[PDB]
């Protein structure tokens, strides 16, 4: 029912606006130990040697790396994605140049995706960047993924009840609710706003008065749009383990400048980056994945803000392996 004091509070607005984070120190810690599990960077290796495009047979992405650097990349990959299963999870045990198992072809596209994130999205990921670990956390299937309908629990390493299961229609509202910070908001903000770029998040007018020609009748955006945008924000808030005042001055949610924080602009690239991963990298993987991984509409698992952030404003508290593994990005 309740959480014992003290609380940990910061300030993001002008004194006396009640803007800032509210954190429970023990929870902040329960996350910190879980994000610390991050495997340390494998010791740097011999730079000299022939490229693996010549050395090996079936290298379509990492060809400009020397063999010594190439196997270090593979080991690192193995730590982050399938450390229980070892190399054999993607590879034919006898033939390492064969594409028999699907995690191989999927991993090459993942390799291409991870390099895209670090290279074409520094507006969001900055110098921290991402690795295979940011999402996977040591399992082939990342803990937090999204289908074209809400599913439970949010952590797919946990067993759902019959009610929590997607076949059971009677838990739909609850499935919906837990994705929107326990609200009754009757909108799936993932499939609406993050699954593609078809919808517009902003709903507030930027004029004091109603503009003629869009203010009456069928010319109007339905009020539902306001509900749905709110839904997305509850989801964004719960995903990063924060609140509205981290990015907005509630006085006016619509206004930038002094009324917004730098984090809001970073969040703005977040929406663009998530959309890009879903449309161009993640959703097309449905053809390459077996049905047991797919959703009820034949879709592949896609990512949201939680996938990387997992309850934290910085994924893994700004832990980076960018310099240590340069082959994963940026690419000049």
């Amino acid at each position: 029912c309740f959480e014992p004091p003290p609380a940990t509070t910061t300030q993001t607005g002008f004194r006396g606006l009640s803007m800032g984070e509210v954190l429970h120190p023990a929870t902040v810690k329960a996350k910190k130990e879980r994000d610390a599990q991050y495997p340390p960077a494998l010791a740097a290796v011999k730079a000299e040697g022939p490229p693996v495009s010549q050395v090996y047979k079936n290298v379509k992405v990492l060809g400009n790396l020397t063999e010594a650097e190439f196997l270090r990349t593979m080991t690192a990959i193995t730590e982050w994605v399938s450390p229980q299963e070892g190399c054999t999870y993607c590879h034919d045990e006898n033939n390492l140049a064969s594409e028999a198992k699907y995690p191989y072809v999927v991993a090459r596209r993942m390799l291409e995706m991870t390099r895209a994130i670090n290279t074409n999205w520094t507006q969001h990921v900055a110098q921290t960047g991402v690795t295979c670990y940011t999402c996977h956390r040591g399992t082939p299937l990342p803990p937090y993924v999204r289908y074209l309908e809400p599913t439970l629990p949010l952590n797919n390493r946990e067993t759902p009840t019959h009610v929590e299961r997607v076949e059971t229609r009677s838990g739909y509202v609850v499935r919906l609710a837990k994705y929107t910070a326990y609200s009754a908001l009757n909108y799936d903000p993932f499939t609406m706003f993050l699954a593609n770029d078809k919808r517009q998040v902003r709903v507030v007018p930027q004029t004091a008065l109603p503009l003629v020609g869009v203010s009456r009748g069928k010319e109007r955006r339905p009020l539902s749009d306001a509900y749905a945008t709110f839904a997305l924000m509850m989801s964004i808030s719960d995903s990063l383990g924060t609140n509205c005042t981290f990015c907005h001055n509630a006085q006016t949610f619509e206004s930038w400048g002094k009324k917004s924080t730098p984090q809001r602009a970073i969040a703005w690239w977040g929406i663009r980056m998530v959309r890009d991963l879903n449309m161009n990298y993640l959703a097309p993987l449905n053809a390459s994945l077996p049905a047991s991984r797919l959703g009820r509409q034949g879709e592949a698992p896609q990512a949201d803000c939680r996938t990387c952030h997992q309850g934290v404003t910085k994924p893994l508290f700004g832990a980076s392996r960018l310099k240590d593994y340069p082959e994963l990005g940026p690419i000049k």
Binding site: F14, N186, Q206, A208, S215, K218, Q251
Partner: protein
């Protein structure tokens, strides 16, 4: 320290009194009873109630609405009774999500809502005829009914008048516990922070005043209960030391005072105005004002604070940034 104003020490029990109305004395139903515990902090007599055509009507249309709302709620949890008890607060019956202008929306997308809303209006319309008629019958003024009508008017404002004026049913309030509460934020955000609508401000100031006035008034009567202050009708027609000490309490405290009749006019007004202010603010929203915050920024009202964190440009304006 008067214990009578905390609770009735010794209770009286007498025969039941029946004031005769000009009609419908036959329409009283039920044998009254007495609760010892209730009679400690109120009057012990419970019942009887009056029936009448306007009473039944409100119960008929009110039940029909309710049965519709409950049915669509039960529907929402695929008719699972355990999942009905559990998820009830989150369940609702919604206005259309899709825009159909003013045209009657599909039963699956707001039709059942509009029909449940019509029967609620009929129920509300009926009960008012009962609050009004029961006053005329007993030779009383219609003060209660006009305060009730103001409250009905506000409900009609947010229920059907505003959706009509802006031309979208989607704007109306969902039926449900959390759902109707969720509308409040949807509505505020869409029209740019209700804190900057002046009529919200007025409405709050009257609601806040209603707290003040009733706290103050109630405490005043209790303070003079020893002189029979609670017998207000005969204190108006024949001034007693009770309302003298009451009037002087305020005149020495705040410098001006009311009479025992007029403080019920101060409270009747302040109550009515909560709803009138509220009604006007809604009526102006969507029709004539689109963003109350920017409406305040225009007429130079909105306060300004310096930047704690650095001024953040809208990234959708930066060169070569996506849509």
């Amino acid at each position: 320290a008067d214990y009578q104003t905390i609770y009735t020490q010794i209770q009286a029990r007498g025969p039941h009194i029946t004031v005769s109305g000009e009609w419908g004395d036959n329409d009283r139903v039920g044998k009254p009873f007495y609760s010892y515990w209730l009679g400690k902090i109120g009057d012990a007599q419970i019942g009887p109630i009056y029936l009448g055509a306007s009473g039944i009507a409100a119960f008929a249309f009110g039940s029909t609405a309710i049965l519709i709302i409950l049915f669509n709620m039960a529907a929402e949890v695929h008719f699972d009774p355990l999942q009905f008890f559990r998820q009830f607060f989150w369940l609702g019956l919604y206005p259309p999500k899709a825009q159909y202008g003013m045209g009657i929306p599909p039963l699956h997308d707001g039709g059942w809502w509009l029909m449940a809303g019509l029967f609620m209006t009929l129920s509300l319309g009926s009960w008012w005829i009962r609050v009004y008629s029961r006053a005329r019958a007993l030779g009383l003024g219609t003060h209660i009914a006009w305060n009730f009508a103001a409250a009905i008017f506000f409900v009609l404002c947010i229920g059907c008048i505003h959706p009509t004026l802006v031309g979208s049913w989607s704007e109306g309030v969902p039926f449900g516990i959390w759902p109707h509460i969720d509308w409040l934020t949807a509505f505020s955000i869409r029209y740019g922070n209700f804190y900057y609508c002046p009529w919200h401000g007025f409405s709050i100031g009257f609601a806040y005043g209603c707290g003040l006035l009733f706290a103050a008034h109630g405490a005043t009567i209790l303070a003079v209960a020893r002189f029979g202050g609670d017998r207000e009708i005969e204190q108006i027609t024949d001034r007693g030391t009770a309302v003298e000490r009451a009037a002087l309490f305020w005149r020495w405290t705040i410098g001006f005072n009311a009479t025992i009749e007029s403080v019920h006019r101060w409270g009747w007004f302040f109550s009515l105005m909560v709803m009138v202010s509220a009604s006007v603010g809604i009526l102006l929203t969507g029709t004539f004002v689109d963003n109350w915050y920017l409406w305040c920024v225009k007429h130079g009202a909105a306060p300004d604070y310096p930047a704690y964190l650095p001024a953040t440009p809208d990234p959708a304006s930066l060169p070569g940034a996506p849509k």
